[PDB]
Design an enzyme around this catalytic site. Structure first.
Site, PDB file in Angstrom:
ATOM      1  N   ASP A 132       1.542   0.653   6.356  1.00 28.82           N
ATOM      2  CA  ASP A 132       2.736   0.310   5.587  1.00 28.82           C
ATOM      3  C   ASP A 132       2.577   0.694   4.123  1.00 28.82           C
ATOM      4  O   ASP A 132       3.082   0.013   3.231  1.00 28.82           O
ATOM      5  CB  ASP A 132       3.042  -1.186   5.709  1.00 28.82           C
ATOM      6  N   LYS A 134       3.586   2.292   1.021  1.00 31.12           N
ATOM      7  CA  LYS A 134       4.797   2.805   0.392  1.00 31.12           C
ATOM      8  C   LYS A 134       4.894   2.259  -1.032  1.00 31.12           C
ATOM      9  O   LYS A 134       4.238   1.267  -1.356  1.00 31.12           O
ATOM     10  CB  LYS A 134       6.035   2.431   1.215  1.00 31.12           C
ATOM     11  N   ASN A 137       4.796  -1.328  -1.932  1.00 28.69           N
ATOM     12  CA  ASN A 137       3.549  -2.042  -1.667  1.00 28.69           C
ATOM     13  C   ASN A 137       2.421  -1.630  -2.612  1.00 28.69           C
ATOM     14  O   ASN A 137       1.255  -1.952  -2.375  1.00 28.69           O
ATOM     15  CB  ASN A 137       3.111  -1.819  -0.216  1.00 28.69           C
ATOM     16  N   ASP A 154       0.450  -6.127   0.919  1.00 31.98           N
ATOM     17  CA  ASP A 154       1.198  -6.236   2.167  1.00 31.98           C
ATOM     18  C   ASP A 154       0.407  -5.659   3.341  1.00 31.98           C
ATOM     19  O   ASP A 154       0.648  -4.532   3.771  1.00 31.98           O
ATOM     20  CB  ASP A 154       2.555  -5.535   2.042  1.00 31.98           C
ATOM     21  N   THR A 171       7.859   2.610   7.704  1.00 29.93           N
ATOM     22  CA  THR A 171       9.126   3.044   7.115  1.00 29.93           C
ATOM     23  C   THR A 171       9.361   4.532   7.391  1.00 29.93           C
ATOM     24  O   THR A 171       8.505   5.354   7.061  1.00 29.93           O
ATOM     25  CB  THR A 171       9.156   2.799   5.587  1.00 29.93           C
TER      26      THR A 171
END
Length: 318
Positions: A132, A134, A137, A154, A171
């Site tokens: 995750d 991105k 984060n 995260d 994502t």
């Protein structure tokens, strides 16, 4: 909430900063140091039946110690709730690190990728995939000299890799091809995501924008460096991104190979004289999180849990 004595004795818990479906976040100043942390309170009544998804996240946070990560300071477990003292990073997210940065150059982007690649290297050494990675984060830690360092947060999708993963998590913009193809993926999906981020750092828009068209772009992995946005960008930087966004996993750079790349390794290659007009493209394509040092800055990373995660990628069934 009846906060345990162990917490209240060494921390002064204040207002509720953030809230979530499974977690509440409060102010939490360490009395001895006056350092500001975040108290993450998880009601155990909500996590019953799915204890492992919370427990697996915590056990990872318990192990990972690295400057470029949002760290778990302390945990206080009681029968009704789980307390987690977390780092409260207030410098905003990655997009703010670009916007807030005047005289923004290739040296700045390279510096951020070093922090990111270093964190990924550390995780992959422990066989931990983040899944995750991105801009949302990646929080900014401001030092006393004005310099900045990113911190990856995260870990709600983080997991130990014992073999190929198949769950379609992440994502769409940053998801790797092998995840989309459901052919089995591992650690190097973090490199792909970091590659997408690096591309954004140097021009302010994703390499793959296209919903199904986006997936096709990712699967083909054809990186375009359109004009005039990439004309004055170093070829070494464009070469690096190419190797980070290779569909062939074995050919794709590892975290080490990124850090060992000249544009990252040698801190003289990155252009530092001519700026990068990136701020304009960021607002056009991406959203803007909480203002730096605001009340809600870096709270979203702590407010979320593994139970808040959901699938987002859906191909047209073949």
């Amino acid at each position: 909430f009846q906060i345990p004595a162990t917490i209240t004795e060494r921390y002064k818990v204040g207002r509720t900063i953030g809230d979530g479906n499974f977690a509440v976040v409060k102010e939490c100043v360490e009395r001895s140091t006056a350092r500001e942390y975040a108290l993450k309170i998880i009601k155990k009544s909500k996590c019953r039946g799915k204890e492992h998804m919370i427990q697996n996240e915590v056990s990872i946070l318990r192990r990972v110690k690295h400057p470029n990560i949002v760290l778990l300071i302390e945990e206080m477990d009681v029968p009704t709730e789980l307390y987690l003292v977390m780092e409260l990073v207030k410098g905003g997210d990655l997009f703010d690190a670009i916007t807030s940065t005047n005289k923004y150059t290739e040296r700045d982007a390279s510096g951020m990728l070093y922090n990111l690649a270093s964190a990924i290297k550390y995780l992959h050494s422990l066989n931990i995939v983040h899944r995750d990675i991105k801009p949302e984060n990646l929080l900014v830690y401001e030092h006393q000299d004005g310099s900045k360092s990113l911190k990856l947060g995260d870990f709600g999708l983080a997991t130990i890799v014992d073999g190929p993963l198949y769950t379609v998590c992440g994502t769409p913009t940053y998801v790797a091809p092998e995840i989309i193809a459901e052919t089995g993926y591992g650690l190097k999906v973090d490199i792909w995501a970091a590659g997408v981020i690096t591309y954004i750092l140097l021009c302010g828009f994703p390499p793959f924008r296209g919903q199904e068209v986006l997936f096709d772009q990712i699967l083909m992995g054809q990186v375009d460096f359109p004009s005039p946005y990439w004309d004055n960008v170093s070829d070494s930087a464009k070469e690096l991104i190419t190797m980070m966004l290779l569909v062939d996993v074995d050919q794709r750079f590892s975290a080490v190979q990124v850090l060992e790349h000249p544009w990252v390794n040698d801190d003289g290659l990155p252009e530092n004289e001519h700026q990068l007009s990136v701020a304009g493209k960021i607002k056009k394509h991406f959203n803007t999180g909480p203002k730096p040092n605001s009340t809600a800055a870096g709270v979203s990373v702590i407010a979320t849990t593994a139970l808040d995660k959901e699938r987002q990628v859906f191909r047209r069934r073949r």
